[PDB]
Design a binder for these strands. Structure first.
Ligand SMILES: [K+]
Ligand SMILES: [K+]
Ligand SMILES: [K+]
Ligand SMILES: [K+]
Ligand SMILES: [K+]
Ligand SMILES: [K+]
Ligand SMILES: [K+]
Ligand SMILES: [K+]
Ligand SMILES: [K+]
Ligand SMILES: [K+]
Ligand SMILES: [Mg+2]
Ligand SMILES: [Mg+2]
Length: 1333
RNA sequence: GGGAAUCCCUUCUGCAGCACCGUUUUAGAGCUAGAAAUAGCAAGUUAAAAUAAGGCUAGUCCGUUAUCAACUUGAAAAAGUG
DNA sequence: CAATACCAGGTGCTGCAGAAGGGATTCC
DNA sequence: CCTGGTATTG
């Protein structure tokens, strides 16, 4: 008995099918277990497993880290209170107790209800004197008077609890506060450099202009307008733009060939500046640094909007400014509305439901919503002009706690904290003794390279301690081994050398590593001149001369430099032909040049004695990112370099690791030669063996030692192995489910292994789109966003997203495009989709007319490339198009598409090459094929074939086996069946294809062949004809009978009984909706803390049921508490689950159930299956809701008619065939009614939604004069009524049908519960009516 | 076909460290005319505390991913069953 | 118990490792 | 978005 298995692996489904020799699907009697009439059931061996998507670990991680942050914020406050404890006990022995119980209702409060002072008079006085905390903060910073210790605590605690960000290293307010003085000094430096061309900055109010609440470009334009002989793109204008945060191009200013684009925010700027400074000299450094300072000032002027010479608390002062302007403008607005619009006043100032001031302060209205609500009211009235100015500046009626306070760096809160400590330490000795401690509480961060400060109970931690004691912010450096921890942080993630598994990989920017790469590329260079008979390798001496003369004097070595600066200068060649490198060498000695610039001792770099040292330095620059740790590690080499060189070395840092170890590159030595790998790369006679040849050469010791060095650790489990695969967790869920399905199918066939296994694997964001366009346009310098504003959601339209990625220009014509005309334009594939089935933005382009691309049979023409390459290069540098997009756009100048390229593209359409699919194939192959033959080579009993989806899709369209996904879930199983059929037949017809299609170990000709690989199924081609019976040429075995086999496929797809199984899963994750609801009299509310009665404090509702439980017991009834027998479904919530499982009987008795039949407790996860009358099925949606449990097996004729009539996919083919399909549609129009009838007879039997079915029948009878195509398209929508799973709404034409829900689970308590195996072929059926009698 | 190193680019998976809001209860004396309903006016910007209930291993740790038909054994892990 | 209607925590930043899709040089 | 929880209405 021989059979094959077809598999369709998806993110939410695994389709599976078993076929025999004749491409038939067997059917078996399967035993049925349980307590019902039925002992067995007939099953077709075809089906599909369905499951909810597997989730990434990201949400879990964000919640985990937020949890740790809340814990540590609490700990900061606790440290501060511990410092304050004794002296506060002297001042007020319950202050911290009142703070602790502030949340409690007065009934539950154990102390007086007024937190700060414990009596109403003092509290009211405090609030009258300090309406905001920032008033108190400013007072405590500025005043010289001794202050109440409780107010000191409140100020310091407010600073520490909300401390601000840590984006800026070092200390702050370094005289770079004033924008005027930094602008004046920028002018000073610029005029120092350009004495002949100076700027008159007198009368220019730099302060107001640069700190104004306006866009960067607008402030630049204002300042430039105040300077007559200066333009915004001149040198001074570019410096101001750099200070304002734009991306100016200094190329034109200094006549540079290198495009000197500088943005102060980019990580590359540190190099980007130095590079520029290399060309125009270091005289301009003092200029480009001066502007930098200005930037800082401007940034701080966004946060501090007050003169810093009247107070040492400019932040708190700016908050008080917010408060005062809020008060003044509120008084003014109240008076204005009273005078002019007295009827609206209430709505504006009393209705929390409306987005007025009342909703802004008391309701849920945001600042943005309030501005939107009140802008027309201000425009409508008189005297609102200043208020409107403030509104458009987003500076009207501001609160102090706002979404935009993320700008505030921690250094400013720290300045205020330090000032308060300095003031009050004169009166409180413990503040003086603990000043730096409190400052440390605010400033300290756990470094990202240290991780959780665990003690052996965190699977996420890696930190090691220098001593075993509790870590605090003050003893962190002494207790935590920061060096070992930072080293572990990297080494727990980095790969070892695969060749030498015990050896650490080298840093990517190591000197030795770049030597290895350069020499490995250089040995395979070859050259010819006139007198030479044959191209020659470079000798060792030649390669060393090329390295010393070119690679050690130029960052990049081009082929032209090789030809002229070596072959002409040294070898006196006037002409030479080079191979092995194109345009320029890929490898380079970049670290060598970095270190040559820093240390300025070429002899030091070339001396081998320093090799170790230099390696170590790069290691330190790579392994660590903290400048203090980098400094500590480079201290051993302090004697070798100047302090200046040591500082410049500190600043230089590298990221990334190589793939080979130092021992492999330059450690192990071939036994007879005594030479390392790098030694052979430098010189290897006339063979010039590279790395691969070296380690694979049987005449050398390298291969032997590599084989010897290998180890193998503990073998992964199946699940472990699948988890470690690189891929989406969703597809990995699919992969594991596929393996389990195959195991069960093999067990079904009596442990006989299949002949073949054919596998096919299936193929917010608007925020990323907006980010890409913002970056690209500001990097481009364009004003298209000024003239055409857009929301992220709008960028989901393909044409508009392309429009903005193309800066509003045609991609093939150097012209502007019109937004309002996008519907008239074309979206065109750069490489045609006949060759590359790519529809991403990466292979798409917006143009006025696709005709302007050139010829349609190839890549855009040479003329278009000549026209548009510069514009494309700008788009590439702005990251609005990718490098691949640019290369495909410009391929015509490189010969365009060759015939080999087109043959390749067709092959790619047919042969699967994704790594994850190969991993699935390897898993199945290693599970099936385990025996070895006489030569100890693997015996491949089971051939694992992988197919791409296009094969079976084209098969379905070519032979009219159409699929309509919306009709039911059968199409997954049908896909699996068709995969088995097509794959088995394809390798039977052409066994030579096995290399391509089976796991395990002229361009026109292949193009033709692979384009015509599937023609053997067809009876007529193009207009050649083919036999009825198709056989293998060598064996003579029959592979395809076009008379009988197609009939078999059709019968299989017509079969109504298909095993669709929805994977039952316990629900996990959040306990409930996160929303903290206000107090309410409802037993649905859940306490947020053990003693916070939701009726007094609010809380949560809407918990998730982890799984339900069938309970058969007795509950007390009435005032008499008479025991009454019950059978019911109890939803165990995720939060309740651990308690319920620790002791189910105690949990259930706590809920009210008595005398619980312990053995009759049935665990019922989500999607548990129940069958009732007339084959009607329900799935458990929850403890109190059900889902539809049936599939509508619509006959094949109706499915194919629906596909053809709706113009599902494309009709394509030939116009005569299109006419035949149209004539069939029109000849079978009655099918429409028949289809409806089917749906109706199904819905009345199984769906039971009388109202919705009647509304649907009315809607169908209403649109009977509509075109047939549209009626069919909407009949497709009708199947949502009958689809398996949760009910959902759907539209028939313009009529909307809301979902009918199954809000009661009582009936399943007497129905039949069906437990299904993973395939559903094995069932256990439990008559629940026989329970609770 | 499978694989390696390098260059240009892109995407995705996993981890750590932080910030700003939001919400919730309490505190920030509402006033006057009426017995009340209510009416007229005043006021509003701030804070504390919680932010999965919680756990033991008690750490400035852990608590939302992955994995899960039923039945027989088995504490379980597991294997076995048509 | 029907039909029905609303609701659902959000934003921003820093640092790091890896595999893998596409193109290119050289090899096993 | 989906779809299960919830209050409201009847
Ligand atoms: K889930
Ligand atoms: K009390
Ligand atoms: K000007
Ligand atoms: K609000
Ligand atoms: K190159
Ligand atoms: K580094
Ligand atoms: K020195
Ligand atoms: K789960
Ligand atoms: K209040
Ligand atoms: K199952
Ligand atoms: Mg907590
Ligand atoms: Mg807040």
């Amino acid at each position: 008995k021989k059979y094959s298995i077809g598999l369709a692996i998806g993110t939410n489904s695994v389709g599976w099918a078993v076929i025999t020799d004749e491409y038939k699907v067997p059917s078996k009697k399967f035993k049925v277990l349980g307590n019902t009439d039925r002992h067995s059931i007939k099953k077709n061996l075809i089906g599909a497993l369905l499951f909810d998507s597997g989730e990434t670990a990201e949400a879990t991680r964000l919640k985990r880290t937020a949890r740790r942050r809340y814990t540590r914020r609490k700990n900061r406050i606790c440290y501060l209170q511990e410092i304050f404890s004794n002296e506060m006990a002297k001042v007020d022995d319950s202050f911290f107790h009142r703070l602790e119980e502030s949340f409690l209702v007065e009934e539950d409060k154990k102390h007086e209800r007024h937190p700060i002072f414990g009596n109403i008079v003092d509290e009211v006085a405090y609030h009258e004197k300090y309406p905001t905390i920032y008033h108190l903060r400013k007072k405590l910073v500025d005043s010289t008077d001794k202050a109440d210790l409780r107010l000191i605590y409140l100020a310091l605690a407010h600073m520490i609890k909300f401390r601000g960000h840590f984006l800026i290293e070092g200390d702050l307010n370094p005289d770079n506060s004033d924008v005027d003085k930094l602008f004046i000094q920028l002018v000073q430096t610029y005029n120092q450099l350009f004495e002949e061309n100076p700027i008159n900055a007198s009368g220019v109010d730099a302060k107001a202009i640069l700190s104004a609440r306006l866009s960067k470009s607008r402030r630049l334009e204002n300042l430039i307008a105040q300077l007559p002989g200066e333009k915004k793109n001149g040198l001074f204008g570019n410096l101001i733009a750099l200070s304002l945060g734009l991306t100016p191009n200094f190329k034109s200013n200094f006549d540079l060939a290198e495009d000197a684009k500088l943005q102060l925010s980019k990580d590359t700027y540190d190099d980007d500046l130095d590079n520029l400074l290399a060309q125009i000299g270091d005289q301009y450094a003092d200029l480009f640094l001066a502007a930098k300072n200005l930037s800082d000032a401007i940034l701080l002027s966004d946060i501090l909007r007050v003169n810093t010479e009247i107070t040492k608390a400019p932040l708190s002062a700016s908050m008080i400014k917010r408060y005062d302007e809020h008060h003044q403008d509120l008084t003014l607005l109240k008076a204005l509305v009273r005078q002019q619009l007295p009827e609206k006043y209430k709505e504006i100032f009393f209705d929390q439901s409306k987005n007025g001031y009342a909703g802004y302060i008391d309701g849920g209205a945001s600042q943005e919503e309030f501005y939107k609500f009140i802008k027309p009211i201000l425009e409508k009235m008189d005297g609102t002009e200043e208020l409107l100015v403030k509104l458009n500046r987003e500076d009207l009626l501001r609160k102090q706690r706002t979404f935009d306070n993320g700008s505030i760096p921690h250094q400013i809160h720290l300045g205020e904290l330090h000032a308060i400590l300095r003031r009050q330490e004169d009166f409180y000795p413990f503040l003086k003794d603990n000043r730096e401690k409190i400052e440390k509480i605010l400033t300290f961060r756990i470094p990202y390279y240290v991780g959780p400060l665990a003690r052996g109970n965190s699977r996420f931690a890696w930190m090691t301690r220098k001593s075993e004691e509790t870590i605090t912010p003050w003893n962190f450096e002494e207790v935590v081994d920061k060096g070992a921890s930072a080293q572990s942080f990297i080494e727990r993630m980095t790969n070892f050398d695969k060749n030498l598994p015990n050896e650490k990989v080298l840093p990517k920017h190591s000197l030795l590593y770049e030597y290895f790469t350069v020499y490995n590329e250089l040995t395979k260079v070859k050259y010819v001149t006139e007198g030479m008979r044959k191209p020659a390798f470079l000798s060792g001496e030649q390669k060393k001369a090329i390295v010393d003369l070119l690679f050690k004097t130029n960052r990049k070595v081009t082929v032209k430099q090789l030809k002229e600066d070596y072959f002409k200068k040294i070898e006196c060649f006037d002409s030479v032909e080079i191979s092995g490198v194109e345009d320029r060498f890929n490898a380079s000695l970049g670290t060598y040049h970095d270190l040559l610039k820093i240390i300025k001792d070429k002899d030091f770099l070339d001396n081998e004695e320093n090799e170790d040292i230099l390696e170590d330095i790069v290691l330190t620059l790579t392994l660590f990112e903290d400048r203090e740790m980098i400094e500590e590690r480079l201290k051993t080499y302090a004697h070798l370099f100047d302090d200046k060189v040591m500082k410049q070395l500190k600043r230089r840092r590298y990221t990334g690791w190589g793939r080979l170890s130092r021992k492999l590159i330059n450690g192990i030595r071939d036994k007879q030669s005594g030479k390392t790998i790098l030694d052979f790369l430098k010189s290897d006679g006339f063979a010039n063996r590279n790395f691969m040849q070296l380690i694979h050469d049987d005449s050398l010791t390298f291969k032997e030692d590599i084989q010897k060095a290998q180890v193998s650790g503990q073998g992964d489990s199946l699940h472990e192995h699948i988890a470690n695969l690189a891929g989406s967790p969703a597809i990995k869920k699919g992969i594991l489910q596929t393996v389990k399905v195959v195991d069960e199918l093999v067990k079904v066939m009596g442990r006989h292994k299949p002949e073949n296994i054919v596998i096919e694997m299936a193929r917010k964001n608007s925020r990323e789109r907006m980010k890409r366009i913002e970056e690209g346009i500001k990097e481009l310098g364009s004003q298209i966003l000024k003239e055409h504003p857009v929301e992220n959601t709008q960028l989901q339209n393909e044409k508009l997203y392309l429009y903005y990625l193309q800066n509003g220009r045609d991609m093939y014509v150097d012209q502007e495009l019109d937004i309002n005309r996008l519907s008239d334009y074309d979206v065109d594939a750069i490489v045609p989709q006949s060759f590359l089935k790519d529809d991403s933005i990466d292979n798409k382009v917006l143009t006025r007319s696709d005709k302007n691309r050139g010829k349609s049979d190839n890549v855009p023409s040479e003329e278009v490339v000549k026209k548009m390459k510069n514009y494309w290069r700008q788009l590439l540098n702005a990251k609005l198009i990718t490098q691949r997009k640019f290369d495909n756009l410009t391929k015509a100048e490189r010969g365009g598409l060759s015939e080999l390229d087109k043959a390749g593209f067709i092959k790619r359409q047919l042969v699967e090459t994704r790594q994850i699919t190969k991993h699935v194939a390897q898993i199945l192959d290693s599970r099936m094929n385990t025996k070895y033959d006489e030569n100890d080579k693997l015996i491949r009993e089971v051939k694992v074939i992988t197919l791409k989806s296009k094969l079976v899709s084209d098969f379905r369209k070519d032979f009219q086996f159409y699929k309509v996904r919306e009709i039911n879930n059968y199409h997954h199983a049908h896909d699996a069946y068709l995969n088995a059929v097509v794959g088995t037949a394809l390798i039977k017809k052409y066994p030579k294809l096995e290399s391509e299609f089976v796991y395990g170990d002229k361009a026109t000709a292949k193009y033709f062949f692979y384009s015509n690989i599937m023609n053997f199924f067809k009876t007529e081609i193009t207009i050649r004809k083919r036999p009825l019976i198709e056989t293998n040429g060598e064996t003579g075995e029959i592979v395809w009978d076009k008379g009988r086999d197609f009939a078999t496929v059709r019968k299989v797809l017509s079969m109504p009984q298909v095993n669709i199984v929805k994977k039952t899963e316990v629900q996990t994750g959040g306990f409930s909706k996160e929303s903290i609801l206000p107090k309410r009299n409802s037993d649905k509310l859940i306490a947020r803390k053990k003693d916070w009665d939701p009726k007094k404090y609010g809380g949560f509702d809407s918990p998730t049921v982890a799984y339900s439980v069938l309970v058969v017991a007795k509950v007390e009834k009435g005032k008499s508490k008479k025991l009454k027998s019950v059978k019911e479904l109890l939803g165990i919530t995720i939060m309740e689950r651990s308690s319920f499982e620790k002791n189910p009987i105690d949990f259930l008795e706590a809920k009210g159930y008595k005398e619980v039949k312990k053995d009759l407790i049935i665990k019922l996860p989500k999607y548990s299956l129940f069958e009732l009358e007339n084959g009607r099925k329900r799935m458990l949606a929850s403890a109190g809701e059900l889902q539809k449990g049936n599939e509508l097996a619509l006959p094949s004729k109706y499915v194919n008619f629906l596909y053809l009539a709706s113009h599902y996919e494309k009709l394509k083919g030939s116009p005569e065939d299109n006419e035949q399909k149209q004539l069939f549609v029109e000849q079978h129009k009655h099918y429409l009614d028949e289809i409806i009838e089917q749906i109706s007879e199904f819905s009345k039997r199984v769906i039971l939604a009388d109202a919705n079915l009647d509304k649907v029948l009315s809607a169908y009878n209403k649109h009977r004069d509509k075109p047939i195509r549209e009626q069919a398209e909407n009949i497709i929508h009708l199947f949502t009524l009958t689809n398996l799973g949760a009910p959902a709404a759907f539209k028939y034409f313009d009529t909307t049908i809301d979902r009918k829900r199954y809000t009661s689970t009582k009936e399943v308590l007497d129905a039949t519960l069906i437990h299904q195996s993973i395939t559903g072929l094995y069932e256990t059926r439990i008559d629940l009516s026989q329970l609770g009698g």
